[PDB]
Design an enzyme around this catalytic site. Structure first.
Site, PDB file in Angstrom:
ATOM      1  N   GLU A 132       0.857  -1.159   0.000  1.00  0.00           N
ATOM      2  CA  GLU A 132       0.000   0.000   0.000  1.00  0.00           C
ATOM      3  C   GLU A 132       0.920   1.243   0.000  1.00  0.00           C
ATOM      4  O   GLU A 132       0.690   2.141  -0.827  1.00  0.00           O
ATOM      5  CB  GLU A 132      -0.886  -0.116   1.225  1.00  0.00           C
ATOM      6  CG  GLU A 132      -1.664   1.134   1.470  1.00  0.00           C
ATOM      7  CD  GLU A 132      -2.414   1.246   2.815  1.00  0.00           C
ATOM      8  OE1 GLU A 132      -1.915   0.750   3.822  1.00  0.00           O
ATOM      9  OE2 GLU A 132      -3.507   1.828   2.864  1.00  0.00           O
TER      10      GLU A 132
ATOM     11  N   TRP B  39      -8.173  -2.326   0.122  1.00  0.00           N
ATOM     12  CA  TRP B  39      -9.019  -1.321  -0.470  1.00  0.00           C
ATOM     13  C   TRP B  39     -10.265  -1.852  -1.266  1.00  0.00           C
ATOM     14  O   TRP B  39     -11.220  -1.114  -1.633  1.00  0.00           O
ATOM     15  CB  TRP B  39      -8.020  -0.448  -1.313  1.00  0.00           C
ATOM     16  CG  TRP B  39      -7.045   0.369  -0.495  1.00  0.00           C
ATOM     17  CD1 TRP B  39      -5.761   0.047  -0.174  1.00  0.00           C
ATOM     18  CD2 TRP B  39      -7.442   1.479   0.092  1.00  0.00           C
ATOM     19  NE1 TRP B  39      -5.364   0.970   0.667  1.00  0.00           N
ATOM     20  CE2 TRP B  39      -6.367   1.822   0.837  1.00  0.00           C
ATOM     21  CE3 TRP B  39      -8.620   2.186   0.045  1.00  0.00           C
ATOM     22  CZ2 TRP B  39      -6.500   2.943   1.574  1.00  0.00           C
ATOM     23  CZ3 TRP B  39      -8.762   3.348   0.801  1.00  0.00           C
ATOM     24  CH2 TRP B  39      -7.684   3.713   1.561  1.00  0.00           C
TER      25      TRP B  39
ATOM     26  N   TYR C 237      -4.895   8.280  -1.713  1.00  0.00           N
ATOM     27  CA  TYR C 237      -3.693   8.997  -1.470  1.00  0.00           C
ATOM     28  C   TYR C 237      -2.749   9.167  -2.622  1.00  0.00           C
ATOM     29  O   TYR C 237      -2.213  10.237  -2.807  1.00  0.00           O
ATOM     30  CB  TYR C 237      -3.049   8.345  -0.386  1.00  0.00           C
ATOM     31  CG  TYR C 237      -3.901   8.464   0.864  1.00  0.00           C
ATOM     32  CD1 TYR C 237      -4.056   9.658   1.517  1.00  0.00           C
ATOM     33  CD2 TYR C 237      -4.503   7.344   1.334  1.00  0.00           C
ATOM     34  CE1 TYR C 237      -4.820   9.713   2.644  1.00  0.00           C
ATOM     35  CE2 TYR C 237      -5.269   7.408   2.459  1.00  0.00           C
ATOM     36  CZ  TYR C 237      -5.419   8.581   3.100  1.00  0.00           C
ATOM     37  OH  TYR C 237      -6.283   8.600   4.194  1.00  0.00           O
TER      38      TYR C 237
ATOM     39  N   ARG D 234       7.232  24.910   5.737  1.00  0.00           N
ATOM     40  CA  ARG D 234       6.087  25.084   4.889  1.00  0.00           C
ATOM     41  C   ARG D 234       6.123  23.707   4.164  1.00  0.00           C
ATOM     42  O   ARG D 234       5.528  23.452   3.102  1.00  0.00           O
ATOM     43  CB  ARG D 234       6.365  26.429   3.993  1.00  0.00           C
ATOM     44  CG  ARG D 234       6.501  27.957   4.525  1.00  0.00           C
ATOM     45  CD  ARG D 234       6.785  29.197   3.557  1.00  0.00           C
ATOM     46  NE  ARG D 234       6.707  30.653   4.016  1.00  0.00           N
ATOM     47  CZ  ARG D 234       6.785  31.688   3.105  1.00  0.00           C
ATOM     48  NH1 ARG D 234       7.041  31.398   1.820  1.00  0.00           N
ATOM     49  NH2 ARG D 234       6.701  33.027   3.346  1.00  0.00           N
TER      50      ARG D 234
ATOM     51  N   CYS E 270      -8.173  10.079   6.288  1.00  0.00           N
ATOM     52  CA  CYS E 270      -7.941  10.103   7.732  1.00  0.00           C
ATOM     53  C   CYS E 270      -6.571  10.679   7.954  1.00  0.00           C
ATOM     54  O   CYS E 270      -6.366  11.388   8.931  1.00  0.00           O
ATOM     55  CB  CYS E 270      -7.837   8.782   8.375  1.00  0.00           C
ATOM     56  SG  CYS E 270      -9.403   8.073   8.792  1.00  0.00           S
TER      57      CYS E 270
ATOM     58  N   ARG F  73      -7.095  12.557  11.641  1.00  0.00           N
ATOM     59  CA  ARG F  73      -8.367  13.028  12.161  1.00  0.00           C
ATOM     60  C   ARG F  73      -9.160  12.057  12.991  1.00  0.00           C
ATOM     61  O   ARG F  73      -9.842  12.617  13.869  1.00  0.00           O
ATOM     62  CB  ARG F  73      -9.296  13.501  11.068  1.00  0.00           C
ATOM     63  CG  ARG F  73      -9.317  12.622   9.858  1.00  0.00           C
ATOM     64  CD  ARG F  73     -10.360  13.014   8.849  1.00  0.00           C
ATOM     65  NE  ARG F  73     -11.652  12.698   9.380  1.00  0.00           N
ATOM     66  CZ  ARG F  73     -12.205  11.524   9.132  1.00  0.00           C
ATOM     67  NH1 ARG F  73     -11.677  10.643   8.298  1.00  0.00           N
ATOM     68  NH2 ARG F  73     -13.335  11.242   9.748  1.00  0.00           N
TER      69      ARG F  73
ATOM     70  N   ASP G 186      -8.737   4.364  14.836  1.00  0.00           N
ATOM     71  CA  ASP G 186      -9.276   3.187  15.504  1.00  0.00           C
ATOM     72  C   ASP G 186      -8.158   2.519  16.265  1.00  0.00           C
ATOM     73  O   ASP G 186      -7.561   1.578  15.744  1.00  0.00           O
ATOM     74  CB  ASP G 186      -9.874   2.391  14.361  1.00  0.00           C
ATOM     75  CG  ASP G 186     -10.242   0.930  14.442  1.00  0.00           C
ATOM     76  OD1 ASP G 186      -9.884   0.331  15.451  1.00  0.00           O
ATOM     77  OD2 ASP G 186     -10.855   0.411  13.477  1.00  0.00           O
TER      78      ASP G 186
ATOM     79  N   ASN H  11      -0.922   2.168  10.945  1.00  0.00           N
ATOM     80  CA  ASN H  11      -0.562   3.537  10.593  1.00  0.00           C
ATOM     81  C   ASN H  11       0.758   4.100  11.026  1.00  0.00           C
ATOM     82  O   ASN H  11       1.358   4.976  10.417  1.00  0.00           O
ATOM     83  CB  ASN H  11      -1.506   4.439  11.098  1.00  0.00           C
ATOM     84  CG  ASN H  11      -2.812   4.274  10.458  1.00  0.00           C
ATOM     85  OD1 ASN H  11      -3.662   5.103  10.739  1.00  0.00           O
ATOM     86  ND2 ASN H  11      -3.096   3.315   9.606  1.00  0.00           N
TER      87      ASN H  11
HETATM   88  O1  LIG Z   1      -6.473   1.968   9.383  1.00  0.00           O
HETATM   89  C1  LIG Z   1      -7.430   2.723   9.669  1.00  0.00           C
HETATM   90  C2  LIG Z   1      -8.773   2.518   9.220  1.00  0.00           C
HETATM   91  C3  LIG Z   1      -9.790   3.303   9.663  1.00  0.00           C
HETATM   92  N1  LIG Z   1      -9.562   4.231  10.509  1.00  0.00           N
HETATM   93  C4  LIG Z   1     -10.828   4.778  10.974  1.00  0.00           C
HETATM   94  C5  LIG Z   1     -11.193   5.711  12.060  1.00  0.00           C
HETATM   95  C6  LIG Z   1     -12.664   5.430  12.287  1.00  0.00           C
HETATM   96  O2  LIG Z   1     -12.791   4.250  13.056  1.00  0.00           O
HETATM   97  C7  LIG Z   1     -13.113   5.111  10.875  1.00  0.00           C
HETATM   98  C8  LIG Z   1     -13.371   6.284   9.997  1.00  0.00           C
HETATM   99  O3  LIG Z   1     -14.606   6.847  10.470  1.00  0.00           O
HETATM  100  P1  LIG Z   1     -14.806   8.338  10.481  1.00  0.00           P
HETATM  101  O4  LIG Z   1     -13.897   8.721  11.530  1.00  0.00           O
HETATM  102  O5  LIG Z   1     -14.370   8.734   9.113  1.00  0.00           O
HETATM  103  O6  LIG Z   1     -16.219   8.454  10.843  1.00  0.00           O
HETATM  104  O7  LIG Z   1     -12.034   4.420  10.276  1.00  0.00           O
HETATM  105  C9  LIG Z   1      -8.325   4.509  10.979  1.00  0.00           C
HETATM  106  O8  LIG Z   1      -8.069   5.340  11.815  1.00  0.00           O
HETATM  107  N2  LIG Z   1      -7.316   3.763  10.546  1.00  0.00           N
HETATM  108  O1  LIG Z   2       1.043  35.694  15.102  1.00  0.00           O
HETATM  109  C1  LIG Z   2       1.846  35.045  14.396  1.00  0.00           C
HETATM  110  C2  LIG Z   2       2.650  35.621  13.362  1.00  0.00           C
HETATM  111  C3  LIG Z   2       3.592  34.888  12.711  1.00  0.00           C
HETATM  112  N1  LIG Z   2       3.788  33.668  13.031  1.00  0.00           N
HETATM  113  C4  LIG Z   2       4.973  33.177  12.344  1.00  0.00           C
HETATM  114  C5  LIG Z   2       5.776  31.942  12.462  1.00  0.00           C
HETATM  115  C6  LIG Z   2       7.103  32.322  11.837  1.00  0.00           C
HETATM  116  O2  LIG Z   2       7.850  33.075  12.772  1.00  0.00           O
HETATM  117  C7  LIG Z   2       6.641  33.268  10.747  1.00  0.00           C
HETATM  118  C8  LIG Z   2       6.129  32.627   9.506  1.00  0.00           C
HETATM  119  O3  LIG Z   2       7.293  32.113   8.837  1.00  0.00           O
HETATM  120  P1  LIG Z   2       7.227  30.804   8.098  1.00  0.00           P
HETATM  121  O4  LIG Z   2       7.100  29.883   9.196  1.00  0.00           O
HETATM  122  O5  LIG Z   2       5.994  30.958   7.275  1.00  0.00           O
HETATM  123  O6  LIG Z   2       8.530  30.764   7.433  1.00  0.00           O
HETATM  124  O7  LIG Z   2       5.542  33.974  11.290  1.00  0.00           O
HETATM  125  C9  LIG Z   2       3.068  33.033  13.984  1.00  0.00           C
HETATM  126  O8  LIG Z   2       3.251  31.900  14.354  1.00  0.00           O
HETATM  127  N2  LIG Z   2       2.134  33.728  14.619  1.00  0.00           N
END
Ligand SMILES: O=c1ccn(C2C[C@H](O)[C@@H](COP(=O)(O)O)O2)c(=O)[nH]1
Ligand SMILES: O=c1ccn(C2C[C@H](O)[C@@H](COP(=O)(O)O)O2)c(=O)[nH]1
Lengths: 315, 315
Positions: B60, B82, B146, B179, B198, B218, B221, B229
């Site tokens: 995968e 899948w 992905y 970034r 996820c 996000r 499980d 993972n």
């Molecule tokens: O390897 C995997 C497979 C699934 N999920 C998950 C999280 C939840 O159990 C579900 C997705 O549901 P939602 O969170 O999207 O509702 O699948 C993972 O975290 N890892």
């Molecule tokens: O309130 C603010 C203003 C700026 N930054 C930041 C993070 C870095 O110092 C810079 C952004 O630079 P890059 O990380 O984008 O290079 O500004 C914050 O975290 N919070």
């Protein structure tokens, strides 16, 4: 106490700091990966060991919630944080005839009068935006800021998506969704961008009757920028609790590069010797409820009793 | 030891668990916000207290890195994770004439023979995809997985962006960028989607000579899905170290709803009494270097000595 999670986050960088150059090499002590939680039913995370302008926090959050992109709303609320993003393109074509302000951020910093000429032509620019619909419309509109990403994502087959307004209909009708995210990162227009969003995303969550929100901050300037970021997103957590008819629980701040700009080391040691004071408590207008069409007057801070302010060198 | 961060993550949900209904109410104990780090120079995070198929992990990951979206590559590597995403639309129009397989996930689970008819018409489907270019091309292509988000973001004004391949030219030429993100979350086509990504995003980072990567999951499980993972993204961290000519440091897993599906509680208590064993050590083919055009044979696991496997009820 309530902010104690902030002051340790500044001591861990004072102990794990890898010196990392970046900036234009300029100087940083950084860590990678950090998470700090604030229990928003004890009080509001505004620091008591630095006075932080709650006024420039709410002005900007309500620009964000109105979906606004225009320097003009902020300027007519005396909040000037976004100004040189648009004072930057002023120093670009056509009507830009006259002064230098040439990557100016650098030279005002090192200047006797480069800075005052910077400082005046900028108010020239500012009380212009305040006053003609055409200049304002043209250069006061930044385009891609949080109001435009939060409330109008730009789709192929031209629409605009309200990301915010749909996860709140989503928190009203499905409290238990783990798909409640807003992302401020579009990866198409992100190299054609001056400042890639720092709050990359956040995700809300309903546990027994109460709302929380977690934030992925890709880069955070520990001293000068996190004080402000904690209360902007712990404001929005109280405001959407407000509209969803829910209660308020946790604000989780999770971090990518958390850093201490090097020119800032004596200053953050000073606040680090201060001792917390109890944090304020935020209440919100009861009878209006849609946060999107709120104004300053509906948010009040009571019993904020700060230590004095610590003046910057900037970032 | 190395995995100790995993087994505590399962004990905290066994102590903070809010029972939360979701699923179709079905049952969960969850926490919100968690971060666990693995130091990949001690060894590879494959669990030693459950035998986890390293084979279905690399098949995968290399589908992901080839930028592939097609069930066919995985099936001709015996890796069937899948399949029912595309066996789902088989049970849809035109040629779907005959059996039921109607939201089948439900009824095989509770079935004597609903499941075998599910189980055969599915291999009908599978050795079809393996064998005609047209069926394969039509239904073996999932569209938004992905490989398509990582290696072909879909832009307005039709292009495709290689998000992965550009942050690695970016880690070769600017090691110190904050970034360096890839986001698998496009918010346009995410309600027209069956499973919203996820792994929402991850962000790499170069500290003194070495590479790390952090992941925002996000929803995870805990028992059945995190084992897998951790090694998929700690594989990719070794593979891009490989190509960037760098060394390997940390894998940080940060979490949104981390949960324990309720039907899984006796099983995760059992592994929780086992005692770690030393983790394997991954080496990679030295002389090929562009990971994107790698195959199984260039990744080997040595000294994996697992405990036995713990068989599911599924999620
Ligand atoms: O390897 C995997 C497979 C699934 N999920 C998950 C999280 C939840 O159990 C579900 C997705 O549901 P939602 O969170 O999207 O509702 O699948 C993972 O975290 N890892
Ligand atoms: O309130 C603010 C203003 C700026 N930054 C930041 C993070 C870095 O110092 C810079 C952004 O630079 P890059 O990380 O984008 O290079 O500004 C914050 O975290 N919070």
């Amino acid at each position: 106490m309530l902010e104690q999670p902030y002051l340790d986050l500044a001591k861990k960088v004072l102990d794990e700091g890898h010196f990392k150059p970046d900036r234009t090499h300029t100087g940083t002590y950084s860590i990678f990966g950090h998470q700090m939680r604030f229990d928003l039913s004890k009080g509001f995370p505004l620091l008591t060991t630095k006075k932080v302008p709650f006024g420039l926090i709410k002005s900007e959050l309500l620009w964000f919630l109105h979906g606004d992109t225009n320097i003009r709303f902020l300027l007519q609320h005396r909040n000037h944080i976004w100004d040189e993003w648009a004072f930057e393109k002023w120093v670009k074509s056509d009507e830009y005839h006259g002064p230098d302000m040439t990557d100016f951020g650098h030279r005002s910093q090192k200047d006797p009068e480069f800075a005052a000429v910077y400082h005046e032509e900028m108010a020239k620019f500012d009380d212009r935006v305040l006053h003609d619909d055409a200049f304002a419309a043209k250069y006061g509109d930044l385009g891609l800021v949080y109001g435009s990403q939060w409330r109008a994502w730009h789709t192929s087959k031209g629409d605009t998506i309200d990301q915010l307004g749909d996860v709140i209909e989503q928190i009203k009708t499905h409290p238990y969704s783990r798909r409640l995210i807003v992302s401020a990162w579009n990866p198409e227009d992100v190299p054609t961008m001056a400042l890639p969003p720092c709050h990359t995303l956040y995700q809300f969550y309903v546990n027994d009757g109460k709302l929380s929100l977690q934030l992925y901050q890709r880069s955070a300037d520990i001293f000068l920028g996190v004080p402000f970021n904690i209360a902007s997103y712990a404001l929005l957590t109280h405001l959407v609790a407000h509209e969803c008819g829910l209660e308020v629980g946790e604000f989780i701040h999770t971090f990518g590069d958390a850093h201490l700009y090097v020119n800032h080391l004596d200053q953050i040691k000073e606040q680090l010797s201060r001792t917390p004071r109890p944090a304020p408590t935020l209440q919100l207008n009861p009878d209006k409820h849609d946060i999107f069409d709120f104004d300053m007057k509906d948010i009040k801070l009571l019993n904020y009793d700060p230590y004095p302010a610590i003046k910057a060198p900037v970032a």
